[PDB]
C-alpha cells in the first residue's frame, strides 16, 4: 500500500507519463528512476515527476 501526494500541478510530456493534482493523491507510487517515479491512479499506471511530486509512504 503506497501513496504519493503532488506538491504542485504538473503536465506529463509523454504518453507513458501522466499528470496529477495537488489534492489528488495517488497510490502504488514506487521509486524506479533516480529522477522519476511510477504510481497508479485508480488503475492508471504512469510516471510521477519527482520534481513536482513527492513519495509519502
Amino acid at each position: 500500500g503506497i501513496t504519493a501526494v503532488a506538491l504542485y500541478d504538473y503536465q506529463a510530456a509523454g504518453d507513458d507519463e501522466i499528470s496529477f493534482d495537488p489534492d489528488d493523491i495517488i497510490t502504488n507510487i514506487e521509486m524506479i528512476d533516480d529522477g522519476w517515479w511510477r504510481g497508479v491512479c485508480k488503475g492508471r499506471y504512469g510516471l510521477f515527476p519527482a520534481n513536482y511530486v513527492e513519495l509519502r509512504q
Binding site: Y8, G35, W36, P49, A50, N51, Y52
Partner: peptide, 19 residues
C-alpha cells in the same frame, strides 16, 4: 519579489557518469 517561478524538469535522457 513575492512570487517564484516553477522548478526545472529532471534530466530524463541525460544522466551523470558518477554519483
Amino acid at each position: 519579489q513575492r512570487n517564484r517561478m516553477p522548478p526545472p524538469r529532471p534530466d530524463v535522457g541525460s544522466k551523470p557518469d558518477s554519483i
